[PDB]
Design a protein around this nucleic acid. Structure first.
Ligand code: MG
Ligand code: MG
Ligand code: MG
Ligand code: MG
Ligand code: MG
Ligand code: MG
Ligand code: MG
Ligand code: MG
Ligand code: MG
Ligand code: MG
Ligand code: MG
Ligand code: ZN
Lengths: 71, 129, 217, 101, 83, 25, 221, 132
RNA sequence: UUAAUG
RNA sequence: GGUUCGAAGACGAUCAGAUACCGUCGUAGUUCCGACCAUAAACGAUGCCGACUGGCGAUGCGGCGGCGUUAUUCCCAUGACCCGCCGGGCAGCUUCCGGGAAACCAAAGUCUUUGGGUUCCGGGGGGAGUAUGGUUGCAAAGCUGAAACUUAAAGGAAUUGA
């Protein structure tokens, strides 16, 4: 803490409540933008229909062809 | 400006203990400071002090020993109950064998052991060990 | 040394102090050396108090005589002013001298041939012998130091305020300290003066040596 | 990192000084930052004085001097070898070079 | 350093400086034991008993060593009270 | 790429976006 | 095999006229010879290598790799040390780390928590130790708890004989050299802290150099 | 470059330190002397050592040499150290005394002395060096 | 004065 | 109002190429007054007030004391010097106070022995000070200010090679 008064509770609580939003995990967990961008929508598993199979080329040094599915 | 006279005086005597002076002049004389010095006197961390009384904020000269490791202060004056005093002496004192946390009570300014003796909590002053 | 009529300052020592100029201090001022000065003169020269100089000489004599072994008291000089003085002081007392070229590591490095582990250091000048102070910082070694008013008191342990620049003053203070330690241990009675003359401990300018060699023959 | 305590200049309590144009370039340098050489110079250096003292009209007349306060920047000073780089212990020694010759 | 029974249970009792009233660690290699000799008042020579003084390395590297020696010697009566 | 001229190019691009938006307004 | 002594203190140790290294730690004499510790505490002394650190410097022909051995040493009652030695080969590195560790053992101070009956088991007060950014704090603990700590300072406190200690950490503790030197500085400052039990004035016994100064000049130079 | 190495120079210093009486000024004499006293395997190294011996003997005949221990020069140094004059310069009939030194000697026990002389104080206080 | 690239 | 310099622009050089560095001109501007803009490596990259813990030689202002020189000239008293004392004003040097990752800092110290009081502000690097919303401005732009997506590093100090 920086302001050490005897009655600075609303100051400390409002400052911490403002500064929690600059954390990466807190803002991602407590805004609905990440939950909207998530295809599962806050789900652990999801069923889906296969439509095509994709051969994805690999990144830097490791060079291979990974096998993916357009679900 | 000067907010906590007690904290300024105890930081002054802490710097004097760290440098190794035999005696130090702290500039204001407050009743809280004088009672704090008598509480350190009854446990024997410091020597015998004196105050210089003009008709102003007087001065205090404290004879210093080398027994005082650190003289600290807890600002502001938090309320301390008998249930919470164990947690205060847990997280502020270096050991449960020595070290003292003085806090002002209804009976008067006295350390945590005499507070346990007389069964009275109160507002915290600081710590010294 | 304290309220003792035997160890008081003597009238034959007063005139030799005034002739050597040990009261004649330096121009500048070190803050640790402020308690030994009576008053600053005109032309900016501090006066070293001779009675307190005698008291510090007495306490250094206590520190020397209290060491039982005489051989392991290190007596160090790097400047040319005290090189003869420390050698003749070691010959008179029984100590082991260091006169010029103090090798770093004589107190710390074992494999070096001159690894001496003394019990007491007697320093001629602090700025000239700052390195024996550093080895006495790592080895448990008390230190005696002939100090000026400008000379600092870093890592010294019992200093004597003197004029360490004057070649007469340095050798005269070595002579006073040598007479005092040899009167404290059972060699010399204090009623009779000592046979050896204080010009033995003085360092000679080689121009004065050539002058005396011309004037003798 | 902070290479100098006084940051290549002598401004400690000012904040702003007037600029001076350089002599070699036309660089706008702060006044305390510029390297300043007050060159004194006898108008003939070595060999012409022996001829002037013979061809002069007035007997034992002193020759004039030419006083120029040159203001160089850092790049011009190091290019014309006015100042050089130094080691990190030798940078703090701000004593001037001697005047024996 | 006793236990509940009262036994000396620590394995060494360390030294303590007589100037700053602070104990000396096990590897405070700059510490001193100044031995001040005693002088017979009628003879003026060495007796045999000593006056010892310990100073830690912090006072030496600060620069208040010989002043503390002078004060302790004046307190114990080695140096004259006039000075 | 200097950050100063990156900032200047972004100011040019913002001026172009404002010019394209004011035409639609 | 036969150790010829170089130091005066090592000569006294070879002459057995000092009874323990407790007086050496009393008078703060530097133990520069390595065989003194093998003489006194060599029966229960234990070596464990913490980590071999392959540091290297860049030269014009590639780089020169030389290994940096860390050795924790100590009998299980008080005296422990931390040796650091970097050398071209790992065997000489570990051997030099053991030698420098024997030169730099320190005793630990152990105390009580609450009730003071029995043998001391924990750190007596909240002490600290640091070098660099690594900060290691030692907390008193009740009996039978165990060293609640990281495995390497748990190993050092298990060697120290502090059976019970809560700890805290601050900084880049992955640097094991600074981490071990920080907990070493903590267990060294355990004796540097002024305990209120030590309020008794110190009656200074005679130094062994001043004790046996006749034998030290009659048996050698 | 005809520069002598350390195996020449240190061995030559040891030869001159041990056998100063035998060696001399002539190269072809003290070369054979060094051949007799020292076991030198090669003639070229022997000639280098003998030449540096001749050069150091020229240095000795000119004056004192730093890195050598000659018995005669050590005896001369011991004599010049043990030289004691007739009367001491500390014993003076007139000793110059400043007035503040007279004041501190007056506040000490030895106020009045037999052979002191209080001088006038140096008026005009200009003792510091001008700046820059 | 010119002297860019891998 | 425009002397000089000089964005844009023109010409001559250099270069494979210069729409650059170089040179010759040259508009806006640079100069004054009345209104906007509110942005800087706006830096001491170090918020403000208060207390304490080492010295040294200085400098600036003001006040005080004290051998003596130099001007008014005919002395007291005031200017210029010399040696000190005090308040803070920018600083500097010195060392194991102490701190820090170190460079370094008498503060960046009095911090795991953690609490003198009070504002603003940061939470891996980009995206991005971007979009959108609001507001200010004649405009340029100023203030507030994300997300989607992407990355296992980006960075600070210091050592050794090149
Ligand atoms: Mg750079
Ligand atoms: Mg500015
Ligand atoms: Mg033009
Ligand atoms: Mg063109
Ligand atoms: Mg152009
Ligand atoms: Mg800004
Ligand atoms: Mg800024
Ligand atoms: Mg904090
Ligand atoms: Mg971020
Ligand atoms: Mg990768
Ligand atoms: Mg940066
Ligand atoms: Zn320029």
């Amino acid at each position: 803490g920086k302001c050490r008064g005897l009655r600075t509770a609303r100051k400390l609580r409002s400052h911490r409540r403002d500064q929690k939003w600059h954390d990466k995990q807190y803002k991602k967990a407590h805004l609905g933008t990440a939950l909207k961008a998530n295809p599962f929508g806050g789900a652990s598993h999801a069923k889906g229909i296969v439509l095509e199979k994709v051969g994805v080329e690999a990144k830097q040094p490791n060079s291979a062809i990974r096998k993916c599915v357009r679900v | 400006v000067r907010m906590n006279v007690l904290a300024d005086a105890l930081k002054s005597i802490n710097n004097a203990e760290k440098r190794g002076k035999r005696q130090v002049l702290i500039r204001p004389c407050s009743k809280v400071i004088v009672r704090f010095l008598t509480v350190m006197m009854k446990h024997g961390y410091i020597g015998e002090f004196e105050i210089i009384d003009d008709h102003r904020a007087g001065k205090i000269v404290v004879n210093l020993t080398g027994r005082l490791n650190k003289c600290g202060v807890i600002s502001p004056r938090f309320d301390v109950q008998l249930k919470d005093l164990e947690k205060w002496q847990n997280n502020l004192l270096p050991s449960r064998q020595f070290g003292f946390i003085v806090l002002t009570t209804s009976a008067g300014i006295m350390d945590h052991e005499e507070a346990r003796r007389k069964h009275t909590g109160g507002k915290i002053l600081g710590f010294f060990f | 040394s304290g309220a003792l009529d035997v160890l008081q300052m003597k009238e034959e020592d007063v005139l030799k102090f005034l002739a050597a100029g040990t009261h004649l201090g330096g121009t500048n001022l070190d803050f640790q050396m402020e308690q030994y000065i009576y008053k600053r003169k005109s032309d900016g020269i501090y006066i070293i108090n001779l009675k307190r100089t005698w008291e510090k000489l007495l306490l250094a004599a206590r520190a020397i005589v209290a060491i039982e072994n005489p051989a392991d008291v290190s007596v160090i000089s790097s400047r040319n002013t005290g090189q003869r003085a420390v050698l003749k002081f070691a010959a008179a007392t029984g100590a082991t001298p260091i006169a010029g070229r103090f090798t770093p590591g004589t107190f710390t490095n074992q494999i070096q041939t001159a690894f001496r582990e003394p019990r007491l250091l007697v320093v001629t000048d602090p700025r000239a012998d700052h390195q024996p102070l550093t080895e006495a910082s790592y080895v448990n070694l008390p230190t005696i130091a002939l100090c000026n008013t400008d000379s600092p008191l870093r890592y010294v342990d019992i200093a004597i305020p003197c004029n360490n620049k004057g070649a007469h003053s340095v050798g005269l203070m070595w002579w006073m300290l040598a007479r005092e330690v040899l009167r404290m241990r059972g060699t010399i009675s204090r009623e009779h003066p000592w046979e050896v003359m204080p010009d033995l401990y003085f360092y000679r300018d080689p121009e004065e040596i050539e002058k005396e060699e011309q004037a003798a023959a | 990192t902070k290479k100098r305590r006084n940051n290549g200049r002598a401004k400690k309590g000012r904040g702003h000084v007037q600029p001076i144009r350089c002599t070699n370039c036309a660089r706008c340098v702060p006044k305390d930052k510029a390297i300043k050489k007050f060159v004194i110079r006898n108008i003939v250096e070595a060999a012409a004085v022996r001829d002037i003292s013979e061809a002069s009209v007035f007997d034992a007349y002193v020759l004039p001097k030419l006083y120029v306060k040159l203001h160089y920047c850092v790049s011009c000073a190091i290019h014309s070898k006015v100042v050089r780089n130094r080691s990190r212990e030798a940078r703090k020694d701000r004593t001037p070079p001697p005047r024996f010759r | 350093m006793q236990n509940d029974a009262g036994e000396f249970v620590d394995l060494y009792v360390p030294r303590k400086c007589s100037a700053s009233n602070r104990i000396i660690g096990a590897k405070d290699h700059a510490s001193i034991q100044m031995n001040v000799a005693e002088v017979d008042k009628v003879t003026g020579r060495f007796n045999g008993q000593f006056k010892t003084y310990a100073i830690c390395g912090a006072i030496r590297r600060m620069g208040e060593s010989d002043d503390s020696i002078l004060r302790l010697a004046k307190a114990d009566g080695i140096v004259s009270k006039n000075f | 790429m200097r950050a100063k001229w990156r900032k200047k190019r972004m100011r040019r691009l913002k001026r172009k976006r404002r010019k394209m938006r004011q035409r639609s307004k | 095999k036969e150790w010829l002594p170089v130091t005066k203190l090592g000569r006294l140790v070879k002459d057995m006229k000092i009874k323990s290294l407790e007086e050496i730690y009393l008078f703060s004499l530097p133990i520069k010879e390595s065989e003194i510790i093998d003489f006194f505490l060599g029966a229960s002394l234990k070596d464990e290598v913490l980590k071999i650190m392959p540091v290297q410097k860049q030269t014009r022909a590639g780089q020169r790799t030389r290994f940096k051995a860390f050795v924790a040493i100590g009998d299980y009652n008080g005296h422990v040390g931390l040796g650091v030695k970097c050398s071209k080969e790992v065997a000489t590195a570990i051997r030099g780390a053991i030698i420098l560790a024997k030169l730099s053992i320190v005793p630990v101070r152990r105390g009580y928590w609450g009730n003071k009956i029995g043998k001391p088991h924990t750190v007596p007060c909240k002490v600290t130790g640091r070098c660099g950014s690594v900060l290691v704090r030692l907390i008193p603990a009740p009996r039978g708890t165990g060293i609640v700590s990281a495995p390497v300072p748990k190993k050092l406190l298990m060697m120290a004989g502090i059976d019970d200690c809560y700890t805290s950490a601050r900084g880049c503790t992955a640097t094991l050299g600074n981490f071990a030197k920080a907990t070493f500085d903590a267990i060294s400052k355990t004796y540097s802290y002024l305990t209120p039990d030590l309020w008794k004035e110190t009656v200074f016994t005679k130094s062994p150099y001043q004790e046996f100064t006749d034998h030290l000049v009659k048996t050698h130079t | 470059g005809r520069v002598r190495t350390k195996t020449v120079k240190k061995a030559a210093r040891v030869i001159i330190e041990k056998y100063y009486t035998r060696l001399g000024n002539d190269f072809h004499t003290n070369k054979r002397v060094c051949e007799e006293i020292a076991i030198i395997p090669s003639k070229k190294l022997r000639n280098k050592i003998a030449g540096y011996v001749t050069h150091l003997m020229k240095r000795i005949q000119r004056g004192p040499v730093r890195g050598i221990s000659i018995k005669l020069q050590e005896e001369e140094r011991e004599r010049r150290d043990n030289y004691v004059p007739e009367v001491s310069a500390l014993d003076q009939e007139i000793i110059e005394v400043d007035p503040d030194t007279k004041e501190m000697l007056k506040l000490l026990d030895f106020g009045s002395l037999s052979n002191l002389q209080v001088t006038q104080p140096t008026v005009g206080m200009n003792f510091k060096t001008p700046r820059g």
